[PDB]
Each structure stands twice: as C-alpha cells, then as structure tokens.
Design a protein around this ligand. Structure first.
Ligand SMILES: O=C(NO)[C@]12CCC[C@H](CCC1)C2
Length: 209
C-alpha cells in the first residue's frame, strides 16, 4: 500500500533549483546529511536525559556511512530520534516552506548553494548527487516507514517491510551515473575530514568486499 503525495510548490521549486543550477561544489551534500544526523542524535540524547527508557530502542548513538558500488548507493545511517509518518509527510521534519523562502532571499543577497543548511533544508542537497533518495525511518512513537522521491514533483510513503531499524534514520542515495566518486573510500574520508571533522558522534565508514 503506497501513498503518493505532491510536494508543496515551494519545495518542488527548491528541488528543481538544486537539480538544475550549475554548481560544481556538490560534495557538501555529505556535510549536510551528517549534520542532520548529528541534530537527530542530539534530540534523542536530550530526551533521554529525563527519560532513559527513550533509549530502550537502542543505546548507541552513532553514524554509519555505507557505500555499495554494485547498487550504486551511498547510505547514511544514524540512530537519532527518527521521524514519524507525519514528520515524513511534513517535509521530513523541516520547516521547508519558510526555510526555502529564507534560502532564496539569501541567494539573492549573495549566498551560494553551499549555505543551504543554514536554512533548515540541507536534506534536499542530496539531489546534488542522487537521482532518487529513499529515507527509512523509525521513531519511538510510530512504525517504520519508507519515504522515496525521484523529484519531478511527488514523493511516496509506505510502511517499511525491510530489516527493522530499532530507532533512527537511513538516507539511501541512489547516485547519478557521473557521481560515483562518492562511493570511493578515499573521497568520503577526504570530505568527512574537510567538512565534518568535529561532529560529536562516532562515524564508521564501512568498506566493501
Ligand atoms: O569516526 C571518525 N571520527 O570520529 C572517522 C575518522 C577518520 C576515518 C573514518 C571516516 C571519517 C570519520 C572515521
């Protein structure tokens, strides 16, 4: 049972800007997704300070980076707070309408695309490098869901049948054919050292057979 939704017009506009603007500095997508993972880990940590049972779904707070050259996918996994179904539908838990407005007024004032994360819509930078993005998420108060979009104005949401997650979010980037550099170990390491070197959670870069 798959539900198909239209993006709000402003978010479709944001996505088509990201996909169609000539902008060579695409590597910042990974900084932005790791930053969102760190924000999600901070949230479940804060809730656990007054209610330790919030970690019954998983005590370890970490980020995994999983490249898969056979599938041409880069997956960013975190064990943060996750998202409910309602969060997923409501622009993956972001204030994306007003964030997109503020971003586009910043661009008019001399900002560039790399500042997207300052406006709360850094998730959508995934579309710098991915043709399709799948988000699998589990929040303590809801069931496990899969969101998916290849842009083009719509996204889908379905109950996830896959491997149970416990709690957190998995972003699966189905990379564009010309963006496979982001599956190479040395390139990922370079980007994490350049842009994410002070993130307060362990990051494990998986290797491949
Ligand atoms: O966990 C990390 N830092 O806390 C690493 C350090 C370098 C090599 C791996 C990939 C980049 C982050 C792991």
């Amino acid at each position: 049972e798959v539900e198909t939704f239209a993006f709000q017009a402003e978010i479709a506009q944001l996505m088509s800007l990201i996909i169609n603007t000539f902008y060579s500095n695409k590597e910042i997508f990974l900084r932005e997704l790791i930053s969102n993972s760190s924000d999600a880990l901070d949230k479940i940590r804060y809730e656990s300070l007054t209610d330790p049972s919030k970690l019954d779904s998983g005590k370890e707070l970490h980020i995994n980076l999983i490249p898969n050259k056979q599938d041409r996918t880069l997956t960013i996994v975190d064990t943060g707070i996750g998202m409910t179904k309602a969060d997923l539908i409501n622009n993956l838990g972001t204030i994306a309408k007003s964030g997109t407005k503020a971003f586009m007024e910043a661009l008019q004032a001399g900002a560039d695309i790399s500042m997207i994360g300052q406006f709360g819509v850094g998730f959508y930078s995934a579309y710098l490098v991915a043709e399709k993005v799948t988000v699998i998420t589990k929040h303590n108060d809801d069931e496990q869901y899969a969101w998916e979009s290849s842009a083009g104005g719509s996204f889908t949401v379905r109950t996830d049948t896959g491997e149970p997650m416990g709690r957190g979010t998995k972003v699966i980037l189905h990379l564009k054919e010309d963006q496979t550099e982001y599956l190479e170990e040395r390139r990922i390491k370079e980007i994490v050292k350049k842009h994410s070197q002070f993130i307060g959670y362990p990051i494990t870069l998986f290797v491949e057979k």
